[PDB]
Each structure stands twice: as structure tokens, then as C-alpha cells.
Ligand binder design. Sequence first.
Ligand SMILES: *[C@@H]1O[C@H](CO)[C@@H](O[C@@H]2O[C@H](CO)[C@@H](O[C@@H]3O[C@H](CO[C@H]4O[C@H](CO)[C@@H](O)[C@H](O)[C@@H]4O[C@@H]4O[C@H](CO)[C@@H](O[C@@H]5O[C@H](CO)[C@H](O)[C@H](O)[C@H]5O)[C@H](O)[C@H]4NC(C)=O)[C@@H](O)[C@H](O[C@H]4O[C@H](CO)[C@@H](O)[C@H](O)[C@@H]4O[C@@H]4O[C@H](CO)[C@@H](O[C@@H]5O[C@H](CO)[C@H](O)[C@H](O)[C@H]5O)[C@H](O)[C@H]4NC(C)=O)[C@@H]3O)[C@H](O)[C@H]2NC(C)=O)[C@H](O)[C@H]1NC(C)=O
Ligand SMILES: Nc1ccn([C@@H]2O[C@H](CO)[C@@H](O)[C@H]2O)c(=O)n1
Length: 318
Amino acid sequence: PEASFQVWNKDSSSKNLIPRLQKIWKNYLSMNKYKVSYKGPGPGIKFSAEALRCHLRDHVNVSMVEVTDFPFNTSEWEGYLPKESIRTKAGPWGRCAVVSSAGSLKSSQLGREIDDHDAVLRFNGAPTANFQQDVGTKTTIRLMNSQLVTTEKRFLKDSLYNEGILIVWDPSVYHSDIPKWYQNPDYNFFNNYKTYRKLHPNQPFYILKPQMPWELWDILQEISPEEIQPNPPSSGMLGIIIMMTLCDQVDIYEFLPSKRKTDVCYYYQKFFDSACTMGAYHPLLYEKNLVKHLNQGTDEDIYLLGKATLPGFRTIHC
Ligand SMILES: *[C@@H]1O[C@H](CO)[C@@H](O[C@@H]2O[C@H](CO)[C@@H](O[C@@H]3O[C@H](CO[C@H]4O[C@H](CO)[C@@H](O)[C@H](O)[C@@H]4O[C@@H]4O[C@H](CO)[C@@H](O[C@@H]5O[C@H](CO)[C@H](O)[C@H](O)[C@H]5O)[C@H](O)[C@H]4NC(C)=O)[C@@H](O)[C@H](O[C@H]4O[C@H](CO)[C@@H](O)[C@H](O)[C@@H]4O[C@@H]4O[C@H](CO)[C@@H](O[C@@H]5O[C@H](CO)[C@H](O)[C@H](O)[C@H]5O)[C@H](O)[C@H]4NC(C)=O)[C@@H]3O)[C@H](O)[C@H]2NC(C)=O)[C@H](O)[C@H]1NC(C)=O
Ligand SMILES: Nc1ccn([C@@H]2O[C@H](CO)[C@@H](O)[C@H]2O)c(=O)n1
């Protein structure tokens, strides 16, 4: 007979959520922090995985702030941004993994498998020490939010960040261009970005353009059958899109949860929070519908391995 088990439900909505997280979702809708007014095609639209993958390649500009973008062409910013394009510095690569920071990675024994990709993406302060056998040992790209660069004093100190290519991103006002964003960043990380840059001139450190997270959000809101949190996508979703721009194959682990689904928010932290898996601030719930929708793997691969497989943009149709 055929096995019965549960993997992520592609049509997850707020009505599936715990009432606790339902109120939180509702409240973020209300305090429209980023002054979002969705004016696109309208809540709820169906795409084939082939078409949506191609609607994603075409309508999201994965690009980094360059020294041509005002005011990063001014004297104070001289020599601060990387000379070369990230695409020059990064691959293009063949096998790539995205390591989510979920607690569900604990005792998953993915460490060797994750190490067998040409390049590995991790987030924020997710550490390697003590976790090699569950998480891997290699860090090629690390995507971080601006809050960590602004406020985490460990960012300028801990030897871990000093591995691979770094990227910082910052939530802007909805549809804001670079100069408006620069004047009003969510966190003021510019000082610390500069200060790091002085410390490690050799290691490539990029700033994501503020437009990218909202371009991805538009598609989310357009897909979902209801209003999603008007806050940018999680680092995890942006990281998926990024690696898709740089890889043929992206294997993404414990984003879609395995059977090890747990309230433990992070593998390196000890505190419990269901919201880390299901979403509170980020529209994480709808991102996972998406990743589950584009998933080219089996449902068994999700149950056992927490593994989704999405193909990279380089290998797509029309
Ligand atoms: C992600 O990031 C993406 C990249 O940044 C981004 O994509 C960009 O989107 C923009 C839209 O938002 C889009 O902007 C348009 O740009 C047009 C010009 O582009 C050309 O120059 C830019 C320079 O930046 C370049 O990037 C682009 O590629 C174009 O270069 C051309 O490249 C061709 C390559 O294919 C090349 O052709 C090749 O040549 C080869 C030679 O061997 C070979 O032959 C190849 O086979 C051949 O293909 C070509 O030579 C070259 N051309 C040039 C000039 O360099 C603009 O035209 C356009 O502006 C118009 O539209 C906007 C609205 O969109 C209007 O506001 C604006 O006013 C313009 O409207 C025109 O207005 C004039 C004047 O009023 C009108 O003229 C009248 O016409 C009448 C009838 O004709 C009559 O004559 C009257 O007398 C005239 O007065 C005209 O009709 C109006 N047009 C229209 C349609 O109404 C616009 O700015 C940009 O191109 C995109 N970039 C890329 C790379 O795709 C993307 O948006 C980002 N994603 C997200 C989600 O944000
Ligand atoms: N329990 C968790 C914790 C985190 N995450 C994903 O991992 C990224 C890094 O924090 C987050 O941005 C999020 O995408 C997750 O899916 N589940």
C-alpha cells in the first residue's frame, strides 16, 4: 500500500495557524510598518512550477549596491564596496545547499551531505563549531540581516563571519529607491559595514539592493489566497532566490520541516518558538507554500531529510 505521512501543505493559510500566531499575523497587517499598498494583479493566482520559476527569474532583480548607485558614488563611500560583481566573486556553482537555521536540524546528521555541495549558504549568526555533523563545516556565502550588523556586537568580533562571501540586507519602505532608502534604513548598519570593511578588506561583503525583497514579496502576495504580513520575506527565502541565481541545483534543508519539526527555534539556541518555523514577522508561511510548490523532490525527501530541491535559474525554460 501507499504510506501516509505529513509534509508541508502548499495551501497553508492563516486559518491553519495556532490562534496565537493568527493574532500576530493580524497585528502585523495592521501596523503596516513599511507602508505597503499592494497594487498588483490581486490576492490569489495560480502558476505552474515551470511558469512560476520563470516568473521568478524574470521579476526579481538579485543585484547588489554598486559604486554607480547614488549616494554610493560619493567621496565618503570611496573604496568601500567590492570592486567585482558578486557573480564574479561567487561561482557560478554546480551543487549548492541552503542551510536554514531551524532547531529541526539537531541530530539530523546532514553534516557530510551538506559538505558535498560546491557551495553552502548560511544565515546571520548560525555557527559551525559544535555542530559540524548536523550542519556541515563549510561556509561559502552568509546572508545576514541589517539588525545583526547594526546591533550584534559579536559581528565585529567572532571569527566565524570571516569565512566566505557576506551579504547584508535591510528592509526599506515599500517601493523605495536607493537614495530614499539610504536616508531611512530600517537599521543603520552603514557605520558597522564600513568598520568591518576596514577590518577585512579582502573578504567580499555586499549590500543587497532594497528593491529585491519587495520584488519577491509582490509575487508572494500575488500567489497567496489572502493578505500576507506586509513585511519583507525572511532571509531564508531571499537566500533561496540568491542561490538560484548562482547555482544549477539548490538543495534546501529544514526550511520545509522534516519529521524533526520542533518548537526549538534554532539549532544553536535553546529557546522555543513555533513562530520561527511558521512565521510571525515574515510571511514565512507563504514562502514555504512557494518552496513546496516549486519542489522537484519527493514527499519522502521532505519527511526524512527536510530536503526540498529547486532548480537554479541558469537551467530554466524560455
Ligand atoms: C531588473 O533590472 C532590469 C535591468 O536594469 C530592468 O529592466 C529594465 O526595465 C526598464 C523598464 O522599467 C527598461 O527601460 C526602458 O529602456 C528603454 C531603452 O533601453 C535601451 O537602453 C537601455 C539603457 O539603460 C538598455 O538597458 C536597453 O537594453 C536598451 O538598449 C538596447 O539594447 C538592445 C539589445 O537587445 C539593442 O538592440 C540590439 O542591437 C544589436 C546590434 O548589433 C542587434 O541588432 C540586436 O539584434 C539588437 O536587439 C539596442 O540597440 C539598444 N538601444 C539603445 C537605445 O541603446 C526605453 O526605450 C524605455 O523608455 C520608454 O518607456 C518608458 C516606460 O517604460 C517611458 O517612460 C519612456 O518615456 C520611453 O517611452 C518612449 O518615449 C519616447 C519619447 O516620448 C517615445 O518616442 C516617440 O515615439 C513615437 C513612435 O515611435 C514617435 O516617434 C514620436 O515622435 C516619439 O517622440 C517612445 O515611443 C516611447 N516608448 C514607448 C514604448 O512608449 C524604458 O526606459 C529597460 O530597458 C530594462 N532593461 C533591460 C536590460 O531589460 C527590470 O525592470 C528590473 N526588474 C524589476 C522587477 O524592476
Ligand atoms: N525554525 C526555523 C528557523 C529559521 N528558519 C529559516 O532559516 C532562516 C535563518 O534564520 C530564517 O530566515 C527562516 O527562513 C526556518 O524556516 N525555521
